[PDB]
Structures are given as structure tokens and as C-alpha cells.
Chains A and B, each alone.
Chain A
Amino acid sequence: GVLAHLEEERDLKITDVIIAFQAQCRGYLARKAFAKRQQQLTAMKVIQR
């Protein structure tokens, strides 16, 4: 058994890899991409007038 558990652990501590990174990726993406749905709105109001 022995050596194989240490390998197990070392995969287990890396099998998620990595929510905290993806959350930063996400974080970044929303506050940029939103600019579109931000943009189109008052434009729709011009169209109405």
C-alpha cells in the first residue's frame, strides 16, 4: 500500500484545481462583459422616441 496513498493525496489536493482561480476569471469577465447589456438599454429608449 504505502507509497500509493501519498500519490492519492497529491492527486486529491490537485483534483479540484482551482475554484479560486475560476472565480477570479469569472469576476473579471462579468464586470467587462456587462458593458453590452449596459449599452443597449437607453438606446432602446431613443428608438421609442
Chain B
Amino acid sequence: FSEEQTAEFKEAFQLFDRTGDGKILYSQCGDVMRALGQNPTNAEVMKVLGNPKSDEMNLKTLKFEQFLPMMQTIAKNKDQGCFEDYVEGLRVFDKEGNGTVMGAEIRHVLVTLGEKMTEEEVEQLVAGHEDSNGCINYEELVRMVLSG
């Protein structure tokens, strides 16, 4: 990366610290990767983390020169999921094909499938994007997560 944006990338990492001690954990790593510009699969992270469990995931520390090879290894990244894949991805539960699903199934599938969400993760994401029948139209929900 350019020392221009790498200066900025450093700052956001430093603003992730808890104390000042220079050490953002194997946990928060995922948010730093995000906040710089990424949307990693929690797997993409786990890959460069070195496969820890909750214990050393919480206990092991990172510093920036331990992080920057990670952020770099992802970034020039394999395949980035288009609008088209994603809509069909949510389209899955449209019992007929309609373009629409009930906001209850949609709140739930994200809390049961793939990289599972909490209710907190879902409500903020989905709410106010169901209509006056309680259907979330998926097409716009997909666009919403894109341009965000």
C-alpha cells in the first residue's frame, strides 16, 4: 500500500486500542480489517490468524506489523460478491419467486445459516425495510449492504 493510506490504516488500528499498550487482539482484528476497507469472511480472518479457539483468540495479541501482512494478504482479494449472486442468495426462500419475503424468516435465516448473526446484528441491518405487509423485499436489502 502507499505510505499515504498506510498512515491512515495505522491510525484506525491505533484507535482500536483499549489502553494504549499497542495490542489489538485476535478478536478485534476482524473489525480493523473491516474498518480499513474490508468485509472479510470470518474464515478469511481465521486463515491469517492461524486457527485459534476462543481462549487464545481472546488471549493472543496483535500489533500493526503483525496485522499489515494480514490486511495485505486478503485485500487484493479473490472474488467479491456481486449484487446478482446476493439477491439469488436471499431469493432462496421466496416460496414462489415474488421478489419478496416475510421479515420473520429473513430475520431468522441470517440468525441460523452461514456466518450466523445475532438479533442485534440482524435488526439494525433489516428493520424499516419490510413494507406495510411485513415483507422485506430482498433486492434493495442487498443493494443496501453494498453501498454502505
Please list the residues of chain A having a beta carbon within 8 angstroms of any beta carbon in chain B.
Answer: 14-31, 34, 38
Contact = CB atoms under 8 A, between A and B. Distances in A.
Contacts of B117: 22, 25
A40 to B, nearest CB: 12
B142 interface: yes
Given A15-B113, A19-B41, A38-B15, A30 B35 contact: yes
Interface stretch (B64-72, B86-94, B129-137): B86-94
A20 B34 contact: no
Interface size class of chain B, counting residues whose CB lies under 8 Å from the partner chain: 20 to 34
A27 B39 contact: yes
A18 B148 CA distance: 18
Contacts of A28: 39, 125, 145, 148
Give the secondary structure class of A's interface.
helix
Nearest to A22: B115
Q: For A14, A21, A26, A30, which residue has the most chain B Cβ atoms within 10 angstroms?
A: A21
7 closest Cβ pairs, A-B complex:
A27-B39, A18-B89, A20-B81, A22-B115, A19-B114, A30-B34, A30-B31
Give the secondary structure class of B's interface.
helix
A30 B16 CA distance: 11
A27 B75 CA distance: 13
19 contacts: A17-B114, A18-B86, A21-B145, A22-B114, A22-B116, A23-B41, A24-B39, A24-B81, A24-B145, A25-B117, A26-B30, A27-B39, A27-B40, A28-B39, A28-B145, A29-B121, A30-B31, A31-B35, A38-B15
A9 to B, nearest CB: 14
A26 B35 contact: no
Interface in B82-107: 85-86, 89-90, 92
